[PDB]
Symmetry: C2
Subunit: 191 residues, 2 copies
């Protein structure tokens, strides 16, 4: 049982992860902990934690390489998104800017775009040191970094940030968006 | 094996601790954090620790049960994801740059995220069993490694921890152990 909010980036990651490794689950659409997984009564939060659990009980369709260093390297790229980007732009943060600072619309956008630039700069950076056979983050299979990247890029277009500066990312996103696992997990697919 | 380190960076504090718990020898350079493995560099504090845990399985920072392992992972994420990033220097600077925020406004911000996170953390703590002041069971783990340094940030910024009895017990206990004590910024 996945408890799901369709506008949630975190939830988008989980939805992709569940598809990629072809895990049979069961969705429960709610409003506004999401995502959260119910495992025979036992509830688990935090999208990165949720994904690592899946990865552990369902080792097939690995979202990470075996090489301990590469595994950690890809992980840290997923963290760039999940730690150095998403947290700053969460609805809760935008609202604090509005409460505390009565941020007008251009202000929220400038803030929001600021962390996009910083996060995509760093991401495309490390991206440039890896080799790939297709437009995925690394290698010849889609992984954890791609799982976290697609939802972040979705947010960026939604807030109309211009991706011109990030060719490799733009390619990977385009590629990934043609897989059912990604496509069917999109928020639009939900409604 | 090299660690680019800053003594008062709570992310590096997390890493220093894990290196100690695992008794891994390493060269420390005070400029982060970044781990330099034979010329190859790795950069996210949570990624680094996961690397230490795969490369050095012994002195496990997490239990074997997949659920409890995931559960403590998520508590660690409460801190690493829902707390620390919002209160990073770069963010505070941004508030003063974009909103010309003042001291007292920066503090209100900083404390709001402290409160929000500790509330959640203390919450999940209440559902868990322990035989000493650690997050879970009778051995320190990854959650402890992330909690202590966050707590340090809370004191450093004069945030009242009165409402988090368990957290406060854990912080106290863990700081009695050399692995934590010797990784603290004061020690550095």
């Amino acid at each position: 049982i996945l408890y799901d909010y369709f506008r949630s980036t975190a939830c988008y990651r989980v939805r992709i992860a569940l598809n990629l490794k072809k895990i049979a689950y069961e969705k429960i659409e709610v409003h506004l902990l999401v995502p959260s997984l119910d495992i025979n009564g036992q509830i688990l939060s935090q999208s990165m934690a949720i994904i690592d659990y899946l990865e552990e009980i369902h080792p097939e369709m690995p979202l990470l390489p075996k090489d301990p260093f590469m595994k950690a390297t890809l992980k840290s790229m997923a963290l760039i998104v999940a730690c150095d980007m998403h947290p700053l732009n969460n609805l809760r943060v935008l609202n604090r800017l509005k409460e505390q600072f009565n941020a007008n619309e251009e202000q929220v956008l400038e803030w929001y775009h600021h962390w996009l630039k910083t996060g995509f700069d760093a991401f495309e950076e490390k991206l440039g040191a890896l080799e790939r056979d297709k437009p995925v983050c690394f290698g010849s299979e889609v992984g954890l970094a791609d799982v976290c990247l697609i939802p972040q890029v979705y947010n960026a277009h939604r807030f109309h940030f211009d991706m011109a500066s990030y060719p490799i990312i733009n390619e990977i996103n385009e590629y990934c968006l043609t897989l059912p696992a990604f496509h069917d997990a999109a928020p639009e697919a939900i409604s």
